[PDB]
Design an enzyme around this catalytic site. Sequence first.
Site, PDB file in Angstrom:
ATOM      1  N   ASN A  47       8.500 -15.132  77.955  1.00  0.00           N
ATOM      2  CA  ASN A  47       9.837 -15.002  78.603  1.00  0.00           C
ATOM      3  C   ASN A  47      11.107 -14.545  77.840  1.00  0.00           C
ATOM      4  OD1 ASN A  47       8.710 -17.531  80.385  1.00  0.00           O
ATOM      5  ND2 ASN A  47       9.059 -15.691  81.252  1.00  0.00           N
ATOM      6  N   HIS A  93      11.892 -15.870  74.980  1.00  0.00           N
ATOM      7  CA  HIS A  93      12.710 -16.821  73.993  1.00  0.00           C
ATOM      8  C   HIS A  93      11.733 -16.898  72.632  1.00  0.00           C
ATOM      9  CE1 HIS A  93      15.521 -18.487  76.908  1.00  0.00           C
ATOM     10  NE2 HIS A  93      14.616 -17.846  78.053  1.00  0.00           N
ATOM     11  N   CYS A 116      17.657 -20.024  68.835  1.00  0.00           N
ATOM     12  CA  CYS A 116      17.852 -18.707  68.006  1.00  0.00           C
ATOM     13  C   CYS A 116      17.787 -17.796  69.357  1.00  0.00           C
ATOM     14  CB  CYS A 116      16.911 -18.564  67.005  1.00  0.00           C
ATOM     15  SG  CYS A 116      17.266 -17.193  66.158  1.00  0.00           S
TER      16      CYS A 116
END
Lengths: 263, 263
Positions: B185, B187, B222
């Site tokens: 996804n 991330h 992050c």
Amino acid sequence: GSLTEDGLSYKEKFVVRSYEVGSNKTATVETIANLLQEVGCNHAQSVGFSGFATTTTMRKLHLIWVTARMHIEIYKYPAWGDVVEIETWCQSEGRIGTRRDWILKDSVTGEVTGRATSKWVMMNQDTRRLQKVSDDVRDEYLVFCPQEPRLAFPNRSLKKIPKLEDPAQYSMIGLKPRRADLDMNQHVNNVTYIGWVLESIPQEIVDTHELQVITLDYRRECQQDDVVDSLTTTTSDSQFLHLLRLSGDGQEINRGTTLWRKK
Amino acid sequence: GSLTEDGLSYKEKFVVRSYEVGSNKTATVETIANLLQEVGCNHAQSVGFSGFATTTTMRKLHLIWVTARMHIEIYKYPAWGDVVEIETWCQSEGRIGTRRDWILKDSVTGEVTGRATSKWVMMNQDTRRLQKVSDDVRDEYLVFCPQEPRLAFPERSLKKIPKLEDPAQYSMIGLKPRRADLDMNQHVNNVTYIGWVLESIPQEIVDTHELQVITLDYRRECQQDDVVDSLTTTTSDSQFLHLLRLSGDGQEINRGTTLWRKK
């Protein structure tokens, strides 16, 4: 996995893992390359090779194999949870070096979904000086390799790659290896360089195309404390020319090309 | 892998790969953490969870689970080629969140070689606002979780971690994620942060000690285009205090502690 019936090739099955896949839920090319390296290592272990995959004469003469070129063509990336079967074998190429080849299959369908080839050269481990293959090493290979030619690519895999000219169209600068990028001997893993090359491809290409072919020449190693810049220019399907060079002095570490197909 | 007999836990076996090991030829802690995440995903799939491991009500309310804390204790790292068995299960912690626990065993001896636990909180996927667990989500968990408490850590995994004070003793600056660090996804993978924490440990500690315990709190994500600095101070076995913060504005991403034993 295990050796085939004739003992001249090696096969292994892998289930694609959750963290191994990208945004379309199929294996990344880096996952694929790691799998190629794992099955290569399992082959070497099964036929009696040593950290490094050396022979007895090589250890005696302080020699190692290093990668000169990696070429991968993917027709279909396996999905998360899918089982892929990989077959690998090696051949000597006279005094030039050796070659390792792979075929990737869907194990449900038995269809070929990818192929790869790599060229390896002999290097003195201490001086880092490249050498020709001796008669005694060729003899060791002969017993574990097919005697008649067997090529994954019977040719894009053999094409000469030119050097990208400044300025590059795209770039990603200040790349550095972390401990997860190193192998058990503390050298940067060959697959890391593939990742670095791909970092200067725009996200848009990645979002809209699939990588079909990558060819990478390996010129010199990145050390654990080095910093790398990744440069790309469109030469076109989209095609790109690639260069990895040390951030400081601009010393070339790799060059390559990629070919991408619209989805 | 598969669910155990009672259907309330999940077990899976893994063979440690060539590229998964560090300089002493045993699995890195990052390899371990990746395997923990893989078996967690396989458990979720087997009990009817969906990219994200959401339930039906969660999708309806646009909710996701995010990690708040990861705690791992390793007694023995498995060697290259060894088979490790991992057992995992989940429990609800009322309205606070949920917990996933793991036990790691040598499959040859059946000895426990490691233990881990993680805390998860509910978050609105759009607003990124943290929420309490609703009564209908608790209800869905209850059918897949043991009803009586089952803890990997009965009676360190719950200790409060303080904030490292400038100046740090050691630092690794300008860390950034590449595409291999992202999940499906897009991330940053939770295990990347573990690697980043460890980057500011001196190579000498790593050469002479084994990591026995790591505790990591996850404060904020992050992003793919962020840059991170990793800070470490000795608090002592050797112990260290850790901070990950965004390179620019110094926004805290993670804090943690590690404990190391001389070899």
